[PDB]
């Protein structure tokens, strides 16, 4: 019992009717926020006289 029983094709459509879109592109943006903190000062004391 030896025979070819089945096959598969590498056939594709010609997408000239634009049935398929494929992958989509969209433009995006992200926002990052960096606030600046204060830090403790350094002091030089001197007399007022």
């Amino acid at each position: 019992d030896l025979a070819v029983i089945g096959f598969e094709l590498d056939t594709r459509f010609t997408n000239t009717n634009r049935r398929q879109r494929g992958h989509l592109l969209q433009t995006r943006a992200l926002q990052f926020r960096h606030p600046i903190p204060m830090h403790a000062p350094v002091t030089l004391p001197m007399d007022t006289m």
Binding site: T27, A29, Q31, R33
Partner: protein
Amino acid sequence: SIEDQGTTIHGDVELVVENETSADVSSVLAEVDQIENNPVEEVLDADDAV
């Protein structure tokens, strides 16, 4: 020019006769321009708004 036109009822086609293509999208988004103006709606200082 596909970039300049839009909503063309009969459609349009251009052929990409080119090798090296670059796409700069930094100026495409309208939101980016809005953020550059003011990331948050501008508010006058309470000391001056009174």
